[PDB]
Design an enzyme around this catalytic site. Structure first.
Site, short mmCIF file in Angstrom:
data_model
loop_
_atom_site.label_atom_id
_atom_site.label_comp_id
_atom_site.label_asym_id
_atom_site.label_seq_id
_atom_site.Cartn_x
_atom_site.Cartn_y
_atom_site.Cartn_z
N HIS A 176 8.51 -3.91 4.46
CA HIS A 176 8.20 -4.25 3.08
C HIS A 176 9.40 -4.88 2.31
O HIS A 176 9.26 -5.90 1.62
CB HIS A 176 7.72 -3.00 2.33
CG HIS A 176 6.49 -2.37 2.92
ND1 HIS A 176 6.54 -1.26 3.74
CD2 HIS A 176 5.18 -2.68 2.78
CE1 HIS A 176 5.31 -0.91 4.08
NE2 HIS A 176 4.47 -1.76 3.52
N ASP B 255 9.94 7.79 -4.24
CA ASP B 255 10.76 7.22 -3.18
C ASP B 255 10.58 5.69 -3.11
O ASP B 255 11.56 4.92 -3.05
CB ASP B 255 10.42 7.89 -1.84
CG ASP B 255 11.44 7.60 -0.73
OD1 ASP B 255 12.56 7.08 -0.99
OD2 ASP B 255 11.11 7.91 0.44
N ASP B 256 9.32 5.27 -3.14
CA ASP B 256 8.99 3.85 -3.19
C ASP B 256 9.65 3.10 -4.34
O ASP B 256 10.30 2.06 -4.10
CB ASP B 256 7.48 3.65 -3.20
CG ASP B 256 6.82 4.00 -1.88
OD1 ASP B 256 7.52 4.06 -0.81
OD2 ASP B 256 5.60 4.22 -1.93
N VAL C 136 9.65 -7.49 10.93
CA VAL C 136 10.79 -6.62 11.11
C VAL C 136 10.52 -5.69 12.31
O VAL C 136 9.43 -5.10 12.44
CB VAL C 136 11.09 -5.88 9.78
CG1 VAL C 136 12.32 -4.98 9.91
CG2 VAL C 136 11.32 -6.93 8.68
N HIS D 134 8.72 0.73 3.97
CA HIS D 134 9.80 0.74 4.93
C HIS D 134 10.48 -0.65 4.92
O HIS D 134 10.17 -1.51 4.08
CB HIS D 134 9.27 1.12 6.33
CG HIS D 134 8.16 0.24 6.81
ND1 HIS D 134 8.32 -1.11 7.02
CD2 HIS D 134 6.86 0.52 7.09
CE1 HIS D 134 7.18 -1.63 7.42
NE2 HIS D 134 6.28 -0.66 7.47
N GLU D 135 11.37 -0.88 5.87
CA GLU D 135 12.21 -2.06 5.85
C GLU D 135 11.37 -3.34 5.88
O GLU D 135 11.73 -4.38 5.26
CB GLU D 135 13.19 -2.01 7.03
CG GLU D 135 14.51 -1.37 6.70
CD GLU D 135 15.46 -2.34 5.98
OE1 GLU D 135 15.66 -3.47 6.51
OE2 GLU D 135 15.99 -1.96 4.89
N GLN E 284 13.40 2.69 -3.97
CA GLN E 284 13.70 1.53 -3.10
C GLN E 284 13.56 0.20 -3.85
O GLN E 284 14.28 -0.76 -3.60
CB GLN E 284 12.77 1.52 -1.89
CG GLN E 284 12.83 2.80 -1.10
CD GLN E 284 12.16 2.69 0.26
OE1 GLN E 284 12.61 1.95 1.16
NE2 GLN E 284 11.09 3.46 0.45
N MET F 156 0.84 -1.17 0.00
CA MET F 156 0.00 0.00 0.00
C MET F 156 0.88 1.24 0.00
O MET F 156 0.46 2.30 0.48
CB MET F 156 -0.87 0.01 1.24
CG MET F 156 -2.12 -0.81 1.11
SD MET F 156 -3.29 -0.39 2.42
CE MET F 156 -2.22 -0.43 3.88
N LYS G 298 3.32 -9.31 10.90
CA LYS G 298 2.83 -8.15 11.64
C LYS G 298 1.29 -8.07 11.63
O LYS G 298 0.66 -7.96 12.69
CB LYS G 298 3.42 -6.82 11.10
CG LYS G 298 2.60 -5.64 11.62
CD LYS G 298 3.39 -4.40 11.80
CE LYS G 298 2.91 -3.69 13.04
NZ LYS G 298 1.43 -3.51 13.01
N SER H 223 6.29 -0.08 11.33
CA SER H 223 5.05 0.39 10.79
C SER H 223 5.25 1.87 10.51
O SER H 223 6.05 2.56 11.18
CB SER H 223 3.89 0.20 11.80
OG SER H 223 2.83 1.12 11.56
N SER H 224 4.52 2.36 9.52
CA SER H 224 4.60 3.75 9.12
C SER H 224 3.97 4.63 10.18
O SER H 224 4.33 5.80 10.30
CB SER H 224 3.90 3.96 7.77
OG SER H 224 2.74 3.13 7.69
N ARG H 225 3.07 4.07 10.99
CA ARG H 225 2.52 4.85 12.12
C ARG H 225 3.52 5.23 13.20
O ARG H 225 3.37 6.26 13.82
CB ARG H 225 1.30 4.18 12.72
CG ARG H 225 0.20 4.11 11.71
CD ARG H 225 -0.91 3.27 12.23
NE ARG H 225 -1.87 2.94 11.19
CZ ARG H 225 -3.12 2.56 11.43
NH1 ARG H 225 -3.57 2.49 12.69
NH2 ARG H 225 -3.92 2.27 10.42
O1 LIG Z 1 1.53 -2.33 2.52
C1 LIG Z 1 1.07 -3.37 3.03
O2 LIG Z 1 1.51 -3.89 4.07
C2 LIG Z 1 -0.14 -4.06 2.39
C3 LIG Z 1 -0.48 -3.97 1.11
C4 LIG Z 1 -1.59 -4.68 0.89
C5 LIG Z 1 -2.35 -4.91 -0.27
C6 LIG Z 1 -3.49 -5.70 -0.20
C7 LIG Z 1 -3.88 -6.24 1.02
C8 LIG Z 1 -3.13 -6.01 2.17
C9 LIG Z 1 -1.98 -5.23 2.10
O3 LIG Z 1 -1.05 -4.83 3.04
#
Ligand SMILES: O=C(O)c1cc2ccccc2o1
Ligand SMILES: O=C(O)c1cc2ccccc2o1
EC number: 6.3.2.1
Lengths: 282, 273
Positions: free
Chosen positions: B46, B73-74, B172, B43-44, B77, B39, B145, B181-183
């Protein structure tokens, strides 16, 4: 599992049909799928033939009475079952694969993840039976996933079903082409259906009214939509103990010009459906 | 007439049909297609998913990025990880007909994450079904996570007879154990200091579990209890498929909590006895 070509191969396990399917595709053959509930009649056979005539085809007919599209009491125990016959008809058609799964193999976890249709599932046939299309689309999705065919065939008789299937396919990005196949009729016009065996001599006689109204409407349509509806209506009213469930003129996607006229009626306890294309002003 | 694909490079497609064409053509030539649905705002966490997918002999990595209703940026990476396909579609491309047919999850979608957001996982499973259909990967990668999410995706796959292995990649964490997490970036310093209690509590519990399930739960709760400003939404021990805790055996301990406006989650593996 073995695959003996030019012969009917019968698999019951999803794993087994999935393996053969995949193997045949990697050999260049094009996988055709015809989902049926068994009790095959000449309307199912037109579906097999369309698939047969696709160059390089290997045909999968599935036979599964799906207990998810039926509801209480009611209709599930009463569905006609004739696998002997069904399989013979398929040998006689030169179909190579019959997929006949068990309820257990299809529903090991019961009703868990399911398909939720769009609002069209709540209308027409889904009015009295609001969970019926969710059951249909769920098993149709599972079947396409198991067999992964190039094309999948459905009769236009169950038009609403066909439309929702095109919805499932678009909405979920399924790499399969959906082939609608015109309705096969008795020589008097009665839309072939396995629900027909439940008509006695009299009702069988009265039953011709559905197709006649529809075809009357198709022709009266040059005088517009009220004229087509009133013509079909009149034919149905002149017919003895045909009890009309609905009679509806819709857009072809089921939302003047080109539309679809749809009828559902009871004869005794026997509910019949039929539909026809309609051109308004043509 | 396949879209252009340059190997060893980052190729971006926004058209579903394009990425579908590339992916299909690549598999015929003996690459194994790996899907990493994201989404965005990578970050790490991912990147650990991406790295697992690269591990596979023959892989071509597809990373979808899509916000379900950091751009350069995405991609930078992804290029930097040596990823060869990004799938960056529009909302209209994914939903050209609005919300019509959807996935209805089983009962587990009503629990846990769950109660605050009753329709969240329906959205999640629907979009995941679609990415699977578009890309048709051999394997799909999800972080642990979001563990309830992974469990429900495995149920999707089983239930709809999907031809894909689900791969669950460990969490991670930052150096002190906070699940990435981005939060995490919203936390003031007090909150960030107190946020260590979720992982602290879960690892205490995992080690207290030789004494059995009550001792695990109680060790986790003691640790949360020692933290200021941490509102616990649930702390629950389930079996690995999120059914009820069996008396001995493998389990999973999940926690959710609110720190000001920021909602944090964590989960751990547990062995009872
Ligand atoms: O950025 C993420 O962790 C992410 C992306 C994503 C896409 C579809 C369903 C769940 C999801 O989690
Ligand atoms: O025998 C039929 O008319 C038939 C069977 C079937 C199975 C799944 C979905 C639709 C269907 O129509």
């Amino acid at each position: 599992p073995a695959f003996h070509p030019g012969e009917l191969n019968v698999y019951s396990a999803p794993g087994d049909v999935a393996d053969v399917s995949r193997a045949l595709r990697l050999t260049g053959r094009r996988v055709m799928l015809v989902p049926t509930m068994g009790a095959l009649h000449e309307g199912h056979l037109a579906l097999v033939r369309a698939a047969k005539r696709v160059p390089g085809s290997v045909v999968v007919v599935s036979i599964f009475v799906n207990p998810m599209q039926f509801g209480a009491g009611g209709d599930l125990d009463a569905y006609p079952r004739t696998p002997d016959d069904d399989l013979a008809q398929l040998r006689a058609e030169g179909v190579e694969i019959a997929f006949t799964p068990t309820t257990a193999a299809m529903y090991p976890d019961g009703l868990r993840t399911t398909v939720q249709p769009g609002p069209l599932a709540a209308e027409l046939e889904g009015g009295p039976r609001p969970t019926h299309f969710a059951g249909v689309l769920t098993v149709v999705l599972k079947l396409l996933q198991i067999v992964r065919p190039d094309r999948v065939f459905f009769g236009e008789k169950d038009y609403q079903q066909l439309v929702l299937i095109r919805q499932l396919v678009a909405d979920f990005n399924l790499d399969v082409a959906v082939v609608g196949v015109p309705t096969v009729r008795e020589a008097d016009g009665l839309a072939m259906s396995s629900r027909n065996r439940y008509l006695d001599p009299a009702q069988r006689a009265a039953a011709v009214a559905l197709s006649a109204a529809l075809t009357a409407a198709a022709h009266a349509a040059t005088a517009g939509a009220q004229a087509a509806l009133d013509a079909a209506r009149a034919v149905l009213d002149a017919a003895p103990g045909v009890a009309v469930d609905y009679l509806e003129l819709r857009d072809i996607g089921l939302g003047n010009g080109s539309g679809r006229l749809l009828v559902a009626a009871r004869l005794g306890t026997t509910r019949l459906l039929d539909n026809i294309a309609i051109e308004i002003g043509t």
